[PDB]
Design a protein around this nucleic acid. Sequence first.
DNA 1: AGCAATAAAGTTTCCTTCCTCCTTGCCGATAACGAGATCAACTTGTTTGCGGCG
Lengths: 402, 157, 50, 1340
Amino acid sequence: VPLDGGRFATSDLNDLYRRVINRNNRLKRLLDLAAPDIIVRNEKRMLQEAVDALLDNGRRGRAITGSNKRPLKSLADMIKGKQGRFRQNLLGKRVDYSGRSVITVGPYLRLHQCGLPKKMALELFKPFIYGKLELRGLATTIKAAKKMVEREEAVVWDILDEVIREHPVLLNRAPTLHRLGIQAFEPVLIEGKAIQLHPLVCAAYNADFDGDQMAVHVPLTLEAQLEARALMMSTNNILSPANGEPIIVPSQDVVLGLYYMTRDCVNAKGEGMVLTGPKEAERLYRSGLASLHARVKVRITEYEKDANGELVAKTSLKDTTVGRAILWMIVPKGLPYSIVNQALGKKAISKMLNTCYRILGLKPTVIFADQIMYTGFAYAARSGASVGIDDMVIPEKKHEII
Amino acid sequence: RSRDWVPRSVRRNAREVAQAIGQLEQELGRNATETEVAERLGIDIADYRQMLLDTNNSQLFSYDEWREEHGDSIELVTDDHQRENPLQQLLDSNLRQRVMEAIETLPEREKLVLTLYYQEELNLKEIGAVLEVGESRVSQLHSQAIKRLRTKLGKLL
Amino acid sequence: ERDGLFCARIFGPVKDYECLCGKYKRLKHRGVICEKCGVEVTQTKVRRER
Amino acid sequence: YSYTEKKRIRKDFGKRPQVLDVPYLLSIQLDSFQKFIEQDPEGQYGLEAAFRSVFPIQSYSGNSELQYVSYRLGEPVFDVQECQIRGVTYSAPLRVKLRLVIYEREAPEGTVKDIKEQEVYMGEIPLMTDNGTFVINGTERVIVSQLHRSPGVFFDSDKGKTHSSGKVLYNARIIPYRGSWLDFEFDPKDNLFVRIDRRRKLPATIILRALNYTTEQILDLFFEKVIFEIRDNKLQMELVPERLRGETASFDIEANGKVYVEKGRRITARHIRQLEKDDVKLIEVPVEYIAGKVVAKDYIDESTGELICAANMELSLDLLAKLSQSGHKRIETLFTNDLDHGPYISETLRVDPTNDRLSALVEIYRMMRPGEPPTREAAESLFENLFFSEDRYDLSAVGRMKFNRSLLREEIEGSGILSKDDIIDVMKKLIDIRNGKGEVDDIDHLGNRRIRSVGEMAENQFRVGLVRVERAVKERLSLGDLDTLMPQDMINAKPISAAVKEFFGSSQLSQFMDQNNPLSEITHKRRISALGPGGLTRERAGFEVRDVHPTHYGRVCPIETPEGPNIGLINSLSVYAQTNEYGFLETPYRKVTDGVVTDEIHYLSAIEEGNYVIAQANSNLDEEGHFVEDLVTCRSKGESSLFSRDQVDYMDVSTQQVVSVGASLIPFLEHDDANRALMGANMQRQAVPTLRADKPLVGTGMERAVAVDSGVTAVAKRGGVVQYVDASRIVIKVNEDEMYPGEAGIDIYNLTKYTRSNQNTCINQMPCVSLGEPVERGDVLADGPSTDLGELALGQNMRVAFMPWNGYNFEDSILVSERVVQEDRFTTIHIQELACVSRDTKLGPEEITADIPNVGEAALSKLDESGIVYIGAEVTGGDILVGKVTPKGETQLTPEEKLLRAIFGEKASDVKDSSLRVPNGVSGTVIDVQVFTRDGVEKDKRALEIEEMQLKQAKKDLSEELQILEAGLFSRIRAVLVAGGVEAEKLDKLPRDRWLELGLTDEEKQNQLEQLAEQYDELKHEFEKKLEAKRRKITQGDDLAPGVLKIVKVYLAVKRRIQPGDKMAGRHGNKGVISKINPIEDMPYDENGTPVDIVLNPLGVPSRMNIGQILETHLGMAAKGIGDKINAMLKQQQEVAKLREFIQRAYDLGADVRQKVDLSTFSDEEVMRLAENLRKGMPIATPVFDGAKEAEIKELLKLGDLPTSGQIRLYDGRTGEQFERPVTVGYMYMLKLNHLVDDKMHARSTGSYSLVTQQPLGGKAQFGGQRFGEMEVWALEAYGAAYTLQEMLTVKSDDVNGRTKMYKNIVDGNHQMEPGMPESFNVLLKEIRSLGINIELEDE
DNA sequence: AGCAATAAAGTTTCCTTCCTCCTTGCCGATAACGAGATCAACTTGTTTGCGGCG
Ligand SMILES: [Mg+2]
Ligand SMILES: [Zn+2]
C-alpha cells in the first residue's frame, strides 16, 4: 500500500516468494539446455533453502534479512508467542462502546451507584437517543437527531435521564486477579470529567486514590444486563469464595470514628445519671451537655427471636457509655446489647457483620453497613482529629539502655 | 536489473547527478545552490525537480517498531480513505424508492427507463432506440422529474 | 500486473468486483454475470480469501 | 550582597562552616566536545587522533599516495535562531589541507614525481550551544553519556556448571577495545581449553605450536625441571626440600649416609629443615620411583633418531634401561605437587592431536573457515589479522595500562597489539589462581567501569566514514592517471555525513530534550546509562548491578532512579562528582593532617579510597584542633566503623556530596523514609510552572545556582545602565572601563515571548528590572518561565490544616476552597502547533486558495484572499484554517450518486479541498503564523507580506542599532568641527549637515573635512552592505523535500485551569487527588474568621512516615506572621528604625548560623523595597542535614505569638461550632502535574477499524477502542455469563454483519442479538493451509 | 396548456492518426588485478530430552 508522499509499505513474504520463482524459472531455462549437472545441484540447494526460509527463516541455516540486518519475517510468527494471533489478536480484544477515565470517591452514595461525567455517557447511549427522537418525532429522521444533538438542547439531557435510570454498566480496574476486579454498578450522572466511586471497594480493586484509571463497558443486550444486575452486582459479591470472609471491611477511618465514640473515659462530666432512651442523648449531645464517652446508666429495649422464628421483646437497664446508647438506635431488631459493650476493634465489626448476616439475612446487614459508614464519617468529622510533633513520644529511658 | 522494478534512464540521470554534483561541489567547495544544478545540467529546473521525486524515494517496510522500544509498530499508525459508511447507502435506497414515489405517476416509458436504468443498472438509450422519438421528450421529462425531486428535504449535501 | 503476485485475474480485480465492460460492480448484484462481455464473476473482497 | 540579592533575601539555619562554592555544573559536555574539535598537535583526541591514526593511504600497487596535513573549519551561514525557525540543523563547515604525493616506481624511492598540495572541502558537522544541546532540523535534542566495562583482561570462575560436580571452573577473558575477544578456561578434568569469540572448545597448546614453539620450550617455561640422574646403575635425584612438603615418603628417604624420612612417613617441616640445612640435593633413590613419572623432553637414540618415549609420556624401568643405555645419565621430568604443582598442561597436551605447526594452523583455519580449501598463506593471513593487524585490532592503552597492572608490570603503555610474553603471563596467572594464588574480582566495583562521552562517539563514526572512503580511494589510486587526477576529483562526502546524521538521529541515546522545567533539562543531561551499544539489556541483566555498591559513595546518588523495569540501572551523577581523565570517576576530599583538617582537596578515585580512611562531616570539628570526639565514625573497606582521632588520613567536605540535586532540595530529608524521598524528587521534576512565579519559603540554598546555569534567563553580560526597556526587548549601555575600544559597546537583548516547548507549553521571559538604574556584571535582567529574582519558582505556597471531612479525604484525596480559582493562580497554557503542506502531484500542483466549493461563507469570513486566517482570532473544532485544494482525475460513478447529482446539482470541479481544520475537541486562540517556500517558486502573497513585515522588523531593528551607534559617532562629527574655530550658535541654528564649509583654516584641517567625509562614506557603506547581506538571507528561499511546493504552519493557544481529577503533591511523596472544591462558607475557620484553603488526610503520615512535611508546616504558619506584623506596621506606616530593629533581630535569632548581617550598611529605600517584598513572608534555607532545631521553630513561633505547637481552635463553616481538639495548621509549598484530566479522558462508541482484520484501534489520537484481556475473561467465566462475552467477542470486536444489524436493531428499539463467526479464525485457517496442510472442518 | 419545428451549442464517442516517446529484448572487442570474512553478538537461564558416549 502507498503512503502520503507516494512511498510504499509491504509484506516481506512477497520477497521470499519472488526468489523462489526466479530460481525455479532459471532451473527450467537451464534444463532446456541439458547443462552440466553441478549447476543444477547448486540451483536446487538454493531452491530448498529458499523454501524453508520462507517457512521459518533462521532454523536450519542462518536467516535472511533486509538491509537493516533484520530478518525477513516468515509465516510461523503469525501464530506464535504473544505476538501470534492467539495471544494478541484472538483472545484479548480491542473493543468499541467502551471508554475510560480517572476515578474518585462518592462517600455519600449508595454502593450500587457510580459517578458519570456527562458527555461520556452522553456519547455512549447515542443510538438509543436517536431511536427516541424518531419515536417522539423530534428527529423525524436521523439527521436532525444528530443536529439537535450537536446543538445540545435541554431535551437532550432530559431524554438521557429518561434512559439511564435502571441502565447498568460494567467497570474495570486493571490487572484482573480475581473475579471481583470488575463489578456491575448503576449510573448516576455528575458534572465533571472524573468518576466518583463508593469507597469501600478500594480493596476488591486494590485501588488507591493517587492516580488510577479505569475503564467502562456495557451490557448492550439484556441478557448481560440482567446477569450483571443479578451476579456481579455489588450486593451479591460481598464474601470471598476462597474463604467465607466479608471482603467489605471498613479499613481505616470509620473504625476510628466508632472507636473514639464507643469509649469509656471517667473524666469529663455528667457521670452517672439516668435516661429513658438514646433520643435524650441526642437531645443532650446535640446541645452539647455530655461527653459521649462516659459510662452512665440508662435503659434499653432488646429483642431476640428465640421462638420458632418469632421475636421476643424485653428491656432492662445498663451502665454503658452513651455512644453505645446511640449506636443501639440503628441496630435492626435482632441483637443483644452485649454487642456494643466494648470499644469495638476492627474484628468486632467483622463479627458484627458476620453475625448479622448469619441470623438476620442479607439486606439488613447491607443497610447496617452503609449507615455505619455515614455515621462514623460524620462523627469522625465531629471528632477533632490530627497529630503533631508533640504527639510523638520518646521514653526517657532509651539513652541509658544504649 | 531483474530485482529492481524501476526504469533505467532514471538511474542514468541519478548517476549523472551524482557525478556532476560531486564534481561541482569540489569546484565550489560547498553545498546546495541548486541553480548550479540547473545551469550545469542546463535542461530545465522542473526536470531535476521532478527527477528528485522520481528517483530518490524508495521502499519501506510495514511492521517496523515505533521507536523507544516496541510501544507499537507502523501497522498501528495507518489511515484509510475508502471506508464503509452505513447511512449513505441507507438513504440512497430511501431516495431510490422516493424516485419511484415520484415517477410512478408519470408517462409509461420514463418511469421504466429511469427505473431499469437506475434500479438494476441497465441501459438508458437502449429505450431511446425502442421508442425512437429522438429523446427530446426524454430530456424534457428527465428535467421535470428533477424539478419534482427538488420537492423534498434531505441533508447529505 | 498480470501473471505476478497481484495477478488480479485469479485473486480478483482491485476494481472491486468490476467486470470487463464495467457494468456490474462493487458488491451490488453479486450473482450476476456481465451479460455484455460474458465474464463470469465472483470475488468482491475474496481478495481476502482466494 | 549583590543588587539582585538585595532585592529579596532567604534566611539560613545552616551552622557548619562551608568551604566550597559549587562548581559550574554541566562542564563535562562542554569539555568533551571542546576537546573533540580542538586542534591538538600531539596529544591527540578525536579528530587528529583519527587522521594521524589513518595516516596516509597508498595504492593497490603501492605507487602513489595522498597525504594528510591539517584542517580547519568555517563559520556557519545562519545564526541559531534562524536555524531553529527555518527548520534546519546548525552546523559548521570543514576544510582540509592535503598533499597528493607520488614517488617514481622506476626509481627506488624517486619521490619527486608529482605533488598536488591543495585544499579540500568535505562535509559540514554540527556544533554545540553554550547550554549543551544540538538542534537538528529545528529540533533541540540531547544524547546521553554512557557507561560500560573497560577493555583489557578479566578473571572469573563459575561454580558447579555441570552441577553433578559441584566443582569450580576458573577462566580468563580478554576484551580489546577494538578487535576480537578471547577465552581461556578449564574442564571438569583439569585440562585447558580456548575459544575466540566463543568458538568451539580447543586445546590451548595447539596455538603454542602455531606460534612456533616446541613442547620442550613449553614446559621449560611452565615447568621447573625434576632432574633424575643415572649414576652407573642407580637412580639418584636432585631435590628441593620444599617440594616434599605435606608429602609422604615412597621408600626409605635418606641421605648418602643418613636417614631423614622412613617408610610410610610424612615429610614433615622438620625434615625440610634438615634437608635444607645439611646441604643435600643429590639423593640415592630406587629406580622404581620413576615408573609413572613422565619424561620432560623427547629423548632419543642419537645414532638412530628414534623416540624411545615421546615427550610428555609416562616413564618406566624398561624405558629406564634403554635410556640409561642411550647415553642419558640425566632425565628431566615434571614436578607434580597436585596440591600445588599440577601438570595441567601435560594433561591438556596429551589430549591434544597435533604435532606440526603447519597442520595446526590448518586445523584452526578449517575450524574458522570451514569447507574452504586449506591454502597455507590464507591461514597465515587469518591468524595475523585476528590479533596482529593494526587494521582490525587495538587496545586503547587504557586497556594496555589496566592490563599491565593486571600483569603487575611497570610499563603503563605499549602497543595496540599483543605480545607472546604477555599471553604466556596470562596462562601462568590463570594456573596460579587455579592453584589458589590470588583471586577473581567483581563487576559492581566502579573501578572496573569506565564512562564514555560524545567526542569518542563522533570519533568512531567519522573514522568509519574514512574507511568507507579509503576503499574506492585505493581502488582508483593504482589504476588511473596520476598527473591529471586531482586529489579531490576522487572522493565523495555523502557517507560521512550519513554516519554523523544518523546517530545524531538514529541512536537510542540521542533524545528530545525535556523542556518542562529547568531541573528536567539539567538533570536529564546529567543522566547516566549502561545501555545501548557496548552495554546491556533489561531481561538478560539481573539484580547484581541494579543493587547498591559502597564505592558509589559520593559519586552516585542512590535515591533517584525509577520504579519501572529499569530500576537501579540508570543512576544520576552526584553533586561534586568528577571524572578521571580516562573515563573513571573521582570525588573531592578534605585531608586530615595531624588531626587538623587541612583545607586542601583531592579528587580521589574509586580505588584509592579502599586503602585509606575517611572522616565524616557530621563529626564535630574541635575548632582548629581536630575532631572533638574519640570514636569517629570513619569508613573504609566497603564499610564504616569507629576509629581514633590522630588516625585519620582524610575527610569528606560536606554532608551533601552523596545526593543528587533533585534529591538535595527537599528540606528535612533527615526525618523520613527513603522510597518516599525517591518518589518525591522523581515527580518533583515532572511539574508545571504556573502563569506566575510564586516563591517558597523553606529552602536549602542551591536554587539560585540551578536558576543560573539552566541558561534560560537574561543575564548581565557586561555592567552598564539601562538604556531602553520594553515588553519585548531592552537596550543597555556599557560601562566605560568595560567598554573596550573597538565597538561602541552596546549590548541589546531581544527576548523570547510566547513560544512553544516540545512538551507543548507557554515559554516566555520578563524583566524584573527597571529603567535608569546601574548594573553589575553577571546579574540577571529578566526572569524566565518559572522563577523569581534568581530563585526557583515552580509551585505556590498555600494554607492547610488536616483532619477528616465527610469522606472527601478517604485515601489521601484532597479538598480545597474555591477562591483560588478566582485567582487562577494554578492556571496554565498549552499552545499547540499545526501545519498544512502544498505538494506537486503526478498530475500537477496542489494549490492553496480561499475559493473552495460547497462552502458556507461563515467559514470563509475569517480568511484572507489566499485562504488564510486573520491573526488574533478565536476558534473551535470544525473550523477551517487553510483552503488547500487538489487537482484530481475522474471516476466511473453509479446511478446512486448520479441521482444525488441530479437532485443536488452541485457540480464537481476537477479539484477537491484538502483543508486544514481544527481537530475535534479543541478550541483556542491563534497568535502567530509562518510560511516556508522554495527557491524557484513564486512566494504566495501573504508569505511575501510576512517576509516584508519581517524586513520591517529586521531593518527596523538594524536601523535602531546603527542609528544609535552612529548617533554616538555624530558626537565626534560635531565636536571635531569645533576644533579650529567657533560658530557658537551659527554652528547650531543652521542645518547640521551644512557645517563643513564653516570657518575653514588650511594647515591640518582640510584633512579633517576629508576624514569627516571618509567616516560618513564608510558608515553608509556598512549600512548598504549590511542591508544587502541580511536582505538576501531573509529573502533566500527554502530547501525542501521532493514533491513539495510550500508549507504553512500555525500555532494556537489554550489555557487550562482545574477541574477535579487533577493530580498534585508536595516534596515528600505526599501524592493527591482532588475529590471536590469547597465554597468558602462551609470551610473550617478560626477565631478571626479566616477560613482555610486546603484540607487533608492524616491517616497516612506514619503509614509511610513522611514526617518532615510536618515540620515545615509549623514554619509554614510561622514566618508568615512576621510579614503580617510588618505589613501591619506598613499600613500603619510606623517608622524606619522600627523596621531596622525588627529585621535585624529576625536575622539575629540563631545560635550559630554562619551568615551574619548588618543593614546600617543598607540605605532607606533599600529597606523600603525589602520590607515591601517581605510583607508576604520571610523565606529561609533549611540545609539538608545541617538543619534547624525545635528550639528554633518554637523560638520563631513564640515571637510570632501563637500556640507553641501551633495547633488551635477552629469552627465549622457549615454549622459554626467548635471542633473537639485543636488542630495543627500552616503552609505547604506544593505543585501541579501533567497527568491531567483532559489529557487522559476518552470515550468511543463507533468509528474506525483495522483493515487486515477489521477490528478496532487504540489511542485517543486515533479514536481508540479499549482492550479486553483474557484475565477479564477468566473472571467472566467465573461468574459464567455466556451471552455477554459472546457479544463482545462477536459484535464489538469482529463480526461485521453482527455490528451492523445490532446497530440497526438498537435504533429500532430492538435490544436483541444474532451471532456469526470471526474472520480472524478463518485467517488462521488460511495461514495453516498455506503452511501446506489440509486443515478443514466437519459440517454438522 | 400539450404538442413539434428550426436553429444553435455542447458534447461524448471515438476513432484515426501521425507525430513522438517509451520500453522489451539482443549482443560486443586491447589486457589482467583476487577464493569471502567486515563489522556484528555478547555469553539469560533453568529444565528437559536426546545423541552420543562411555
Ligand atoms: Mg493507584
Ligand atoms: Zn462486462
